[PDB]
Amino acid sequence: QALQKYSTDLTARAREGKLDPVIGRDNEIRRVVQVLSRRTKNNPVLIGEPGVGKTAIVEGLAQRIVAGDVPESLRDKTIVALDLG
Amino acid sequence: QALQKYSTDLTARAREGKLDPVIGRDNEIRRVVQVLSRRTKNNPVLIGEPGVGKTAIVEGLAQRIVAGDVPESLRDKTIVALDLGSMVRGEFEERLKAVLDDIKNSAGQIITFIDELHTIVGNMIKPMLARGELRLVGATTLDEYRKHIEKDAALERRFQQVYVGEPSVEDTIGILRGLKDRYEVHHGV
Amino acid sequence: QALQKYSTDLTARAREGKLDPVIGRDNEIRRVVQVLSRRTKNNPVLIGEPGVGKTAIVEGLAQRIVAGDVPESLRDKTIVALDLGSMFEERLKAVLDDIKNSAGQIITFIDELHTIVNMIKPMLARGELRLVGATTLDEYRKHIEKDAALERRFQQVYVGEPSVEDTIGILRGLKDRYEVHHGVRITDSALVAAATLSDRYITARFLPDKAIDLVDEAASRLRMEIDKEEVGPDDIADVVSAWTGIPAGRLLEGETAKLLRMEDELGKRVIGQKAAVTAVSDAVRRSRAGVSDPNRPTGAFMFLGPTGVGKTELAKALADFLFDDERAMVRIDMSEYGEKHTVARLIGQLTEAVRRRPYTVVLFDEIEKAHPDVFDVLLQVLDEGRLTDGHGRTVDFRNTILILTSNLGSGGSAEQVLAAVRATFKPEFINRLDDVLIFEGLNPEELVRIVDIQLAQLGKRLAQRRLQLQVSLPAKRWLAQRGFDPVYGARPLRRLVQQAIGDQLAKMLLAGQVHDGDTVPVNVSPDADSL
Amino acid sequence: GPTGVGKTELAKALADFLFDDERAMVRIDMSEYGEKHTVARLIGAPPGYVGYEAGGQLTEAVRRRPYTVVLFDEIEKAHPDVFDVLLQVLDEGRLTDGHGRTVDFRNTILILTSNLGSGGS
Amino acid sequence: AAAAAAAAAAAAAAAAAAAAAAAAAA
Ligand SMILES: Nc1ncnc2c1ncn2[C@@H]1O[C@H](COP(=O)(O)OP(=O)(O)OP(O)(O)=S)[C@@H](O)[C@H]1O
Ligand SMILES: Nc1ncnc2c1ncn2[C@@H]1O[C@H](COP(=O)(O)OP(=O)(O)OP(O)(O)=S)[C@@H](O)[C@H]1O
Ligand SMILES: Nc1ncnc2c1ncn2[C@@H]1O[C@H](COP(=O)(O)OP(=O)(O)OP(O)(O)=S)[C@@H](O)[C@H]1O
Ligand SMILES: Nc1ncnc2c1ncn2[C@@H]1O[C@H](COP(=O)(O)OP(=O)(O)O)[C@@H](O)[C@H]1O
Ligand SMILES: Nc1ncnc2c1ncn2[C@@H]1O[C@H](COP(=O)(O)OP(=O)(O)O)[C@@H](O)[C@H]1O
């Protein structure tokens, strides 16, 4: 019952439709996905300059997970946005 | 109903005549209402010197709402003001998090207000800020805007600058002859 | 009506008449009735000192209220003081309860409202009470100088002590109060001179109540010395002069005792500077007799001189004479004072050194190491109040004297020296000090007594092991060849005293043979002086 | 004119009449500007060198208090790299300092003094 | 019949630093 009062849920927030119609960036999506499913040390960082859509990539990953266009070992994986504030 | 205790309500005091007139200045309200109906980069901050009428801009906006002149997107939406002077390590964050209760529980477009927002800042409001349920109307002064929310900003892309400099003397004469009979109330000569 | 057990009242006391005779403070009531009768920016705050009688200001206000002269917005107002020593907010619901039904007719009066700042602030901004209060300026800042959410509904009214004449002539209502113990007739001449003799314990105290404090402590010391049914002005003088008094020290006017001579200790310690002797005697005669000005330090001069003249020794020669202690001076080593960041550390360092000791003459030797922001701090000291600091607890520089001994224009005789002097005074350092004097360096007649002081010092160093010296005048003038050099100064003389005598004495003293109880004579040689 | 006459006393007699102060005038001394390198020391030129924190010896008195009365003590010795800098003041009421600001002189008062007047009236 | 159980605390206040800003001296 811990990670339901200190965290949202972008997957259940996408079932309603409260996200954006993301378009584009095919290379960086797979650049994230092929890193997120390696064996050990499997965590990326989206480094960029401010304003180029470093959040829309993760929302597009959420829509690609909900839709069903992922590789094999990413079935129904329920991504969660935490905070520390 | 539970957290409307440690704040005030400018909208509730509209139907009692507690607020002064706003005579002059029919342009900053149009600027603020033009901001406050947008989609992104909403919630403006009034920037100006102390003792000009930023509070008067908010109060004239409230009177113009409770008569009914704003567009339909902002129709029948009450405005609360919030407190900073009775706040203060620790326990300011928890009092903040307790304030955010009815803000979340309102589930509407109940517009808040903060006086002197440079004092408060940063990371405790931005995931709540970039979602679209609160309308953080503020009020600061220019070199305090430069001091806090340009140095420790980190979320500066989500505020606006509505410059209110000062009324000149010839406008002030018409203002003070307009704001005349309120001191025929108390003493009266 | 449930507030009687939580608060006092000021409506039945004045109708009874248990009130002091209020004298003065008519303009204060003139401000209070005015500011209280306002539509906005009303209900002020009385700022004074701790121990003025702002309480009694409100008492006389209630006395004029029950008399009846007031305007419309002050219809007798039935004011109530709240108990400060009776509180958390589990009673304060009922405390403000009898303020809710009030129509602004039971306006209250809190004391020291900086401890109130969540509970009373919506009631303040609503318009059913006013809540006049009274704090102190330094504590008026620190709580409520940085919190401008409610710095609009409070207006300061600065009040101080009354004048000296009214404070002395107000003591005719004091003729009953404290004296219950054994009853001596406090004489009118003792009464009119009692508050006159005020700064003879300390001047850091204030006028009104501290006059009665000196009177009470003096009557205590009197009737515990004589265990007479009368007093005397000399008797209360040396009775007040008991605690901070050596055998009471510097009793009456006293310029005849210690201040006319002024140079028997000075001229015997520093030899020369005769024009400086006469001029600084005249300068202390006009300055520290209170016939200079109002609130200056009033001691403010400058003279000059190169190295070896004794610019450090001449300052310390009067440290143990002016206020007769080693702690009776202050100087600064400004080597860390060069920019606008060194200003932010003493405004502090000097402030607590004057707060502990309101006792010290100040010494600023050189000027070429002085960052120019320090001067504008110092210009506010002269003729512009005392000084400020970081917190606000200021100290008035009532017994301080500013001295400048700089070698700025050592090549200039009359013209070039004053031309360089005038240029380095940024504003207002010239006409606000007084006249500038010239050094009188190493001279053949004024050279002997220096050697006398140094040989007395060396005899002090040798008297522990019971050895002493006999020094003749031919050796004393043999040293005068390598002791004159009027550019660098008398410091190679002080070195050569320990050079020529010291190594011979040290060689003889460690190998026996100069056994204790023996004396040592001097024996002149053209280059050495053997023993 | 001569010395000790009341020469600067006339300036303070009008520094309080129109400028309401005794601390209104800011005098300087032009008895140091006789070398060709110390001419810019009154205004302080570059960002990065010795005089930048101290600022201009003329300009830092008028950037704040823009209502002074300037007095030039003994103008008649200084090098003629001052005179064009003195002239451009009364060409347009502006003078660009070392930081980069533009300081207005168009409502101040200039006074130049000299000590001739020994023999000839 | 309960107790008091005096709890602990933690304090923090950081430090500053200065910069020197050399001058090219010509
Ligand atoms: N491929 C995309 N499809 C749709 N909208 C996009 C796309 N890329 C960017 N955007 C929009 O660009 C904006 C990006 O907003 P954010 O990514 O949240 O801010 P940011 O670009 O990350 O910069 P910061 O550092 O977060 S303030 C949003 O309005 C997105 O809708
Ligand atoms: N256009 C206006 N019409 C009527 N009153 C005005 C107008 N502009 C200013 N005022 C008055 O100016 C006074 C200033 O009050 P505030 O607006 O609270 O001060 P402020 O300008 O908000 O600065 P702060 O917030 O107190 S630091 C009030 O008495 C207002 O009634
Ligand atoms: N007129 C004098 N009377 C007494 N001692 C003197 C006199 N002139 C010099 N001296 C002594 O000469 C020595 C010089 O020490 P200082 O007082 O430090 O000299 P100074 O004039 O202050 O120059 P500096 O800057 O301190 S080296 C001390 O031992 C003084 O006591
Ligand atoms: N004008 C005055 N009239 C009568 N008494 C005064 C007056 N000024 C001071 N006092 C004396 O001072 C006392 C009141 O001081 P108070 O107001 O308590 O000082 P503070 O308010 O600084 O604590 C009274 O007892 C009174 O004798
Ligand atoms: N005409 C004058 N009126 C008033 N004071 C004068 C006059 N002339 C000289 N003084 C005295 O001289 C001082 C000012 O002299 P100042 O004008 O500086 O002379 P100068 O400018 O020629 O050097 C004042 O302190 C004043 O005491």
One-character DSSP codes across chain B: --STTSSEETTGGGGGT-S----S--SHHHHHHHHTT-SSS---EEE--SSSSHHHHHHHHHHHHHHT-S-GGGTT--BEE---TT----SHHHHHHHHHHHHHHH-S--BEE-S-GGGT--TTTHHHHTTSS--EEEEE-HHHHTTTTTTS-S-GGG--EEE-----HHHHHHHHHHS-TTHHHHT--
Residues of B in contact with C143 (CB under 8 A): none
Q: Do C427 and D53 touch (CB under 8 A)?
A: no
Q: Which residues of B51-62 are buried (b: 16+ CB within 10 A; e: fewer)?
A: ebbbbbbbbbbb
Q: Which of B20, B29, B116 is the pocket-test mutation for ligand 2 (most atoms within 8 Å of CB)?
A: B20
Whether the Cβ atoms of residue C521 and residue C470 lie closer than 8 Å to each other: yes
Whether the Cβ atoms of residue C120 and residue C96 lie closer than 8 Å to each other: yes
Q: Which residue of A has its CA nearest to B130?
A: A55
Q: Do D53 and C339 touch (CB under 8 A)?
A: yes
Write the DSSP string, C385-432. Answer: -S---SSS-----TT-EEEEE--TTSS-SSHHHHHHHHHT--SSSSTT
Cβ of residue D74 closer than 8 Å to a chain C Cβ: no
CA–chain centroid gap for C435, Å, is 25
Rounded Cα–Cα distance for residues C486 and C427 (Å): 34
Rounded Cα–Cα distance for residues C364 and C406 (Å): 8
- Which of the 8 DSSP states describes residue C82? B
Residues whose CB falls within 8 Å of the CB of residue A11, separated by 6 or more in sequence, listed in order: A62, A65, A66, A78, A79, A80
Kindly tell me whether chain A and chain D come into contact, counting contact as 3+ Cβ pairs under 8 Å: no
Cβ of residue D37 closer than 8 Å to a chain E Cβ: no
Instruction: Of C407, C424, C421, C490, give the one whose Cα is nearest residue C453.
Output: C490
Instruction: Of C46, C41, C48, C47, give the one whose Cα is nearest residue C150.
Output: C41
- Which of the 8 DSSP states describes residue C51? T
Rounded Cα–Cα distance for residues C224 and D54 (Å): 64
Q: Count Cα atoms within 13 angstroms, Cβ side, for C117.
A: 24
Rounded Cα–Cα distance for residues C143 and C392 (Å): 13
Provide the phi-psi class of C318: left if phi over 0, else alpha when psi is between -120 and 50, else beta: alpha
- Which of the 8 DSSP states describes residue C83? P
| Beta strands in C218-345, from DSSP E residues, in sequence order | 299-303, 329-331
Instruction: Of B122, C295, C414, give the one whose Cα is nearest residue C422.
Output: C414
Rounded Cα–Cα distance for residues B129 and B155 (Å): 10
The backbone torsions φ and ψ at residue B102, rounded to the nearest 5 degrees and listed phi first, read: -70, -25
Number of other CB atoms surrounding residue C103 within 10 Å: 7
Question: Packing angle between helix C491-510 and helix C448-462, nearest 10 degrees?
Answer: 30
Provide the phi-psi class of C305: left if phi over 0, else alpha when psi is between -120 and 50, else beta: left
Cβ of residue D23 closer than 8 Å to a chain C Cβ: yes
For ligand 3, what atom is nearest to the CA of residue C272?
1
Run of H or E residues at C436? strand C436-437
**Residue with token string 């901050």:** B45
Instruction: Of C510, C509, C507, C504, give the one whose Cα is nearest residue C527.
Output: C504
Whether the Cβ atoms of residue C359 and residue C392 lie closer than 8 Å to each other: no
Q: Name which residue sits closest to atom 13 of ligand 2, judged by CA.
A: B53
**Residue with token string 């609160």:** B134
Rounded Cα–Cα distance for residues B25 and B59 (Å): 12
Query: What does the block give as tokens for B53?
Result: 């009428």
Residues of C in contact with D23 (CB under 8 A): 427-428
Q: What is the separation, in whole angstroms, between the first and last Cα of chain D? A: 9
Provide the phi-psi class of C10: left if phi over 0, else alpha when psi is between -120 and 50, else beta: alpha
Run of H or E residues at C469? strand C468-470
| Beta strands in C247-396, from DSSP E residues, in sequence order | 299-303, 329-331, 361-364
Domains observed in chain B: 7-163 (3.40.50.300)
Rounded Cα–Cα distance for residues C420 and C498 (Å): 38
Our CA-based measurement puts residue C121 at a distance from the nearest CA of chain B, in whole angstroms, of 9
C-alpha angle C110-C111-C115 in degrees, rounded to nearest 5: 95
Give the amino acid at C102.
Answer: S
Run of H or E residues at C142? helix C137-144
Instruction: Of C159, C28, C18, C2, give the one whose Cα is nearest residue C10.
Output: C18
Q: Which residue of C has its CA nearest to D27?
A: C427
Polymer length in residues for chain B:
189
Q: Do C148 and B8 touch (CB under 8 A)?
A: no
Whether the Cβ atoms of residue B120 and residue B84 lie closer than 8 Å to each other: yes
**Residue with token string 């070195």:** C495
CA dihedral C471, C473, C478, C484 (to 10 degrees): 110
Q: Supply the CATH classification number for the domain C7-158.
A: 3.40.50.300
